[model samples]
Target: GSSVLEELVQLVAAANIDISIKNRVITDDIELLKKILAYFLPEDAILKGGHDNQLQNGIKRVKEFLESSPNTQWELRAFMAVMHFSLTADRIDDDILKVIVDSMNHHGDARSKLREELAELTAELKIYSVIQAEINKHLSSSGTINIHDKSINLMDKNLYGYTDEEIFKASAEYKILEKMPQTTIQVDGSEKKIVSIKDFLGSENKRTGALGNLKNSYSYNKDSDKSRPLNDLVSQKTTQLSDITSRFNSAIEALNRFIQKYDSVMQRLLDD
Candidate 1:
């Protein structure tokens, strides 16, 4: 109905970044619950005493769990499904969503409806995950920063025959990338905060047909000054590719963790 879902998605993603890149773990129960569920669940949202603390404590435990593996981040849309389900029907009384692996609740047929949405959203999420995983795989821990092949998006064609909705979904993914924070990287044997992939890499126009310029100007330089910009362009593109791919991988990693957080509940929903 509004961008609230998108905003919360990024909030979840931001929490993912806070834990992963900064090592700033959530030590307080309120803080963890705040990041995970506070926005959606306002005051008077909880009446279940044990359930309240249970969700808070369980979320705290997961924060600890997430801290142990930097890879375990939250998924956006699935969390949305959780939130939406939580807010709808009788679950709205609880405000924090009644279901997921650690905490499960429901409102009759809405549970069925949620399962239907899950089937749809989970599949959509998987497609995005596979793309990110591929980006992660070929993108090495070291050596060449060039993607060498990934920017098929450069063609900007529906090469895989993506559905129209998928196209919109991709655009939506790009929209929320800002929530992921800047990361530190090793530069010249030192550490500093300077490497957020989404910061400068989401622009589709980053490439300026320098493709033809560099390839056309190949076979060594006639003069250093003449070749300078091309060399600079190459580094620029490689850096963009590296950042872009890294961003995709991190988002995918977060999505996996989010999905994992609710895995058992999803299975049970399917069973019923």
Candidate 2:
């Protein structure tokens, strides 16, 4: 009846990001209990634990803490944790809903009324997982930079004529490049740090003076022609990366719509 399942898919995709959160505050037991209640009960809902004194006290503690807290980073971190849990739980919940919907076994039965909604949830989950898996595979150990112990400015280095393949094959020869010290250079009236290797043979350059001709002996190809193969390789992968980015953007939009719809329904339920 609602887009909750579709939105849940969007939530999963959006939650995947490059940032890591550390030094997080641990949620306490009373706070954890309140989180559970928030998942299953309306904001203003109360439990009457008449005979059970402990249950009554626990509820009191949760309500009091909620009223006293100033909504600090502690709460913000806890909410982020809940959003992560929501993505996982939503999938399992959809599966369980499907089982119940199938077992009803009658078209007009009250339980059978959930059939269409369950089908919609299942379809969304299926596509969501597929897209999520593909993105993760490409993201794993794949990027523009390969050097971990050193830094090479892609814009300044003329690779002597080796394609990405040949450079990586003989990468060990460039050990001098490792941990090279950065020197300051003036850029647009401000000083900026830069690392560079000199071209020695063709011109008077510190890094490449005698080695310049030796390096140039590999090929006299123009920079554009020398770079064409790597450029083509990049172009191929960039297309796929763009495809993944576009898919995520669409999912994000759908998720935003789902979030608005869910918030509206929840608010209405609490009001009632």
Candidate 3:
């Protein structure tokens, strides 16, 4: 398991890499970008609290369900993410792109949306790659490489490794953004976008009549304000649930161990 600080740094680096990829064309440095994306994984270790099987089991269940319903939105999103990455990684040869476009275009509306989204995503990535290239032109090499080098420390990146979706689920130590964190969800982007808990509050309620009710009821902490955020209360409930599960599992483990030891003792007595 990584220290929370290490996890924090890892997230920042991952975002930088994602942003970097979007900003540029296929560069020879694809490997370096991959390293950055992997940083996001270490942070997942924290999110899962080092419970390997919890995540694996969750994935297994999801996989089983997907086998029944093959073309899920989640599966489609993953394909879109990867297809974008592959093409932008300069790995998309003409033959591959041609086959995919021609063959997949006849699939369905879902495929069409994914294709459109992927195409738009690719274009947006180029916009950032171009900007970063321009920044590198005038800045020192080190400065260019680390875009947030100046304010890097200023960023409260304890929030790294979290996708916008995860932000909604997180409680303890985070209020979470039910909608997109105001940082990422915005009407305009000409201004500098910074991630902060304050930016996320009540953002969704402002625009939409319906709430998804996806955010945790618990919050990072409680102090000022009439009552704790719904997320805080939710976090408390989840902690209770986890404690119950852990206790039950522990009892089962202890009982199994005791039975094994008891059988061994019985065998020794019989031998004597």
Candidate 4:
């Protein structure tokens, strides 16, 4: 059980590593220019309290869940949470609770073989998405999502895995412009053929839309600019997207195995 807690953290952390790395690619550079230039001008800022990371928000509740429930009662206690969500979400009726509790009281004890399985699930209750019946219903063994205009899949190994269409789109757009070609940037009645990627980034960095919704990566946050300016916009994002598709492919496989092994069991538990 102790190892399982660490495993949960490690799983989420792997995805986070890729996220912060890519974010660094954007953040490190964006901040580099912003902070230096801002230092040369008047400065004002505000202080705010820190926010909890994903693990922080879950660990306390997860630990409490683990400590409060005995092995034989794990399923019953966990079911209460499932029942709560469905009730709040209006998927189940309040009248169903009485019969459900009766069934649970009769046969809810974990068999010796099922003890480890129960713990695996208890540890998983809060951190990952698979524990949810709805999320499992939508998983793809291919690790690909067919949703239009969006390639991001939070359920993917990295938590921000890309779909096929997104990878294709990003690639075509990013590299298509990278061959030392030119772009047209009409600024205030001036016409210049943008030459290099670095200069193109520099050009846009000076523009009104330079920093597009960069407060965080698409992995977890966004909005202001689903759009951004820079070097080969398509080329930059698409090419980077190309490599990451495989990383999350591994994520898909790992997640799918877990689902294949236990989805029916857990799904029935909740449905019951």
Which candidate leads the pack in TM-score? 1
Query: Largest lDDT belongs to which candidate?
Result: 1
Clashes of 1: 2
lDDT for each of the candidates?
0.36, 0.32, 0.32, 0.30
lDDT of 1 by residue, 1-272 (tens): 22333343344444543322113343233344344444444435422244455445434433343333333433332334445333332222221132232222121333443353344334324334433443444334431222222121212124234556547445423333323234444545666553132222333333212244222112232333344433344445555545444444343334344445445444443332
lDDT score for residue 167 of model 3: 55
Clashing pairs in 4: 170-238, 171-238, 173-234, 173-235, 174-234, 174-235, 174-236, 175-235
**TM-score, candidate number 1:** 0.25
Q: Rank the candidates by TM-score, best first.
A: 1, 2, 4, 3
Misplaced by over 4 Å in model 3 are 1-108, 140-272
lDDT tens digits, residue span 1-272, model 2: 12322332233234331111123333333333333334533322333234745334433433333333333332322233233223322211222222222232122232233333333333323322332333344334353222111223321323423457546334422332333445445556876664422111122311212222222111113343333322233334345444443444344333344345445544543443
Candidate 2 has its poorest 10 consecutive residues by lDDT at: 211-220
Worst 10 residues of 3 by lDDT: 146-155
Can you give the lDDT of residue 178 in candidate 1?
Answer: 28
Which tens-of-lDDT digit does each residue in 1-272 have in candidate 3? 33433332233233322222213432234444333333323343322325455434433332333233323222222222222323222123222233233333234333344344343333323322332343344343332222221212112323333346555244322332233253433325545554332333223432112223333222233333555433343344434434433443343333344335434543443332
TM match of model 3 to true structure: 0.19
